[PDB]
Ligand binder design. Sequence first.
Ligand SMILES: CNc1nc2c(CC[C@H]3O[C@@H](OC)[C@H](O)[C@@H]3O)c3nc(N)[nH]c(=O)c3cc2[nH]1
Ligand SMILES: CNc1nc2c(CC[C@H]3O[C@@H](OC)[C@H](O)[C@@H]3O)c3nc(N)[nH]c(=O)c3cc2[nH]1
Ligand SMILES: [Cl-]
Ligand SMILES: [Cl-]
Ligand SMILES: [Zn+2]
Ligand SMILES: [Zn+2]
Lengths: 371, 371
Amino acid sequence: DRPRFSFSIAAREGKARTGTIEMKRGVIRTPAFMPVGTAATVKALKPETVRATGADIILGNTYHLMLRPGAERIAKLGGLHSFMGWDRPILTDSGGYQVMSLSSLTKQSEEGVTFKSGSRHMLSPERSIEIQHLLGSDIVMAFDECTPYPATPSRAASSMERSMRWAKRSRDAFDSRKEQAENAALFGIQQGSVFENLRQQSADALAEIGFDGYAVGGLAVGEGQDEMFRVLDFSVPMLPDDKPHYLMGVGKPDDIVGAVERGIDMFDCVLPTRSGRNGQAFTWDGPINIRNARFSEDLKPLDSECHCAVCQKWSRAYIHHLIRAGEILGAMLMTEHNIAFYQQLMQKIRDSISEGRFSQFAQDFRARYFA
Amino acid sequence: DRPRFSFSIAAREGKARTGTIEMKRGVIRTPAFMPVGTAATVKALKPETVRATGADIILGNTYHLMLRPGAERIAKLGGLHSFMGWDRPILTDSGGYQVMSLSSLTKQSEEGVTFKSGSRHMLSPERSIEIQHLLGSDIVMAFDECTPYPATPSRAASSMERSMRWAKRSRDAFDSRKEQAENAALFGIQQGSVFENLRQQSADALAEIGFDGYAVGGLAVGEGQDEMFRVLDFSVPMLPDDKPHYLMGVGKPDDIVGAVERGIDMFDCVLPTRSGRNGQAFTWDGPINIRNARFSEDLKPLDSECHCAVCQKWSRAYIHHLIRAGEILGAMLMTEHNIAFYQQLMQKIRDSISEGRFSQFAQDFRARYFA
Ligand SMILES: CNc1nc2c(CC[C@H]3O[C@@H](OC)[C@H](O)[C@@H]3O)c3nc(N)[nH]c(=O)c3cc2[nH]1
Ligand SMILES: CNc1nc2c(CC[C@H]3O[C@@H](OC)[C@H](O)[C@@H]3O)c3nc(N)[nH]c(=O)c3cc2[nH]1
Ligand SMILES: [Cl-]
Ligand SMILES: [Cl-]
Ligand SMILES: [Zn+2]
Ligand SMILES: [Zn+2]
């Protein structure tokens, strides 16, 4: 049977790596893209359709499930996997992004954060880890604060220092629960805003505690690609080489390619699902907005090479009609195609690294996607 | 290869019949339930999922598709079957119900009806039949007026008489288009409100013209089950015995059972799809509203005997959560289950007639459904 957690690197090209994470509930091929399902559903898809696109793992969120349907309720019903019908690994975020994005609803202290709708709900390192246990998460995220962007060096340091104290509390809470420690994995989250010295201090603190994987937090918060890449250039090498590197919240296809070139192994983003429902379809020739009148009589599939079931069966003209009409099937088809596109991107990335031609793939990808 | 149209009755019990309609695009088992897809989609279902529930034919509508995406457009794109990805028979309504339901938007005359949004669109016997040709409909409905309910005898007679003149024009328009006459079928629609003498005059006029099937129009418009059944008691025997009998707009499960007991072979209704999206699930023990708090921790499937994929995989508690949260997957799962329930009802009806035990089935069905 599979181990609790084993990350193996099969091939490398520059800073890019490809390999596998073995866990009890399945194997995750890296670099990996995780579809997001905050409400215990990847919006508009059955789990079997998510799997048919090639996803090996999906993301849930402590914050959203605590509010609805409730963490204790999900545990009483048999856990998140059984509840939603996804039997493979699930990574759960800790709520640390909502500490920032929903801060106007909050009172924060060294002990944690209380959110006020008028109902109140508290998160802390201990309670976040407990919720993730009740959900039955396979990859548990430390409870952090996503520092707002921009941040002054002083405020970035204060925030990062609190997150590192919270990372140690997260580690100890996870380890004190035997069933969780034996069956799940725990990832730490690096903070430090855009400042190299703070990123180094954060990496050192996380490596001293020790985690199964390391996320780069605090990015994809408005800084733009040039700045994100500049921060990744120095930040990813600070993390332990032999553990997965997870860039939280990224991103557009070109963001993913450049992040892999900088040593990232895992990604999550709502872009393919949310923007799909809004009419944006990803193609090898760049995104299109299917609502545009130019598609009303276009009999081609969304993308001319895509192998997904949507592109095998339906035209741009039909999907244009569905989205314009507000039809649920439009959201279903756009979402399936976009998630399939993202997984095909990841597959091409993995194969090109394995074959030592990833730098050429990245150049070819960009030349065509931005033509 | 299959004929244009052949209806065969394999077994009978009282006024109830079971058999098949053979058409070029497939076989329809009767009594049949037709899921409704007015916008070129059965809402929230891929066609393959519609088929997996057991549906042999679906319903589209001249009126809705004329407005969006347009009849000529659908023809240019290869027809409705190719457009939406359903390759089996499609029955299209003629717009005659919208002549009544949307009458405040209309100007009516002996020549037809013009609808005003501010764009204007005209329907007539000739234009309705032409639109149904452009869509590539397999069963074409005559252009009628659905008489409002209640109606005075005078107004019911005037309306019915106009519909019969329009039925003859529909017949002649259909026959004058060789490709349509050779590959599709045409059904006439009986009117006459709740009045036996007018129903008889309408049946006689339709039989004199001659049609491939006969619909009972003008019911399921607020009259209630007792009155609907009273009208069916005398109306269905007036129609040719050897052709299908289609009750437009019916209905709830008990309405379907009683209508089959009165000689109806075909049904359409938005109830399973629309009420599914609103949280109503059909079960052998009667309908339930999945939004009710009593389902929040109920691990049973929607229905304890249902063979559908939803009942094999997900609990009431999960679907309750999805519907309460407004999640698209909730609409998808409720809809698939309800359409599957309707098809299982039709299968039990067909099997019980074939075995000469339909009267016992109807009694058992009602005892349990209304317990
Ligand atoms: C979009 N860019 C971005 N996302 C981010 C997320 C995930 C939000 C998670 O919250 C929900 O999205 C609002 C989804 O579940 C998502 O996975 C982050 N999570 C944590 N714990 N810490 C971060 O520093 C952080 C930074 C992010 N930047
Ligand atoms: C609900 N009860 C009911 N439906 C009916 C429909 C279908 C409406 C069609 O219009 C759309 O629903 C508003 C769907 O496509 C539906 O199939 C009818 N159609 C015609 N042509 N003539 C009738 O006398 C008639 C009576 C009905 N009674
Ligand atoms: Cl989303
Ligand atoms: Cl509907
Ligand atoms: Zn595709
Ligand atoms: Zn079911």
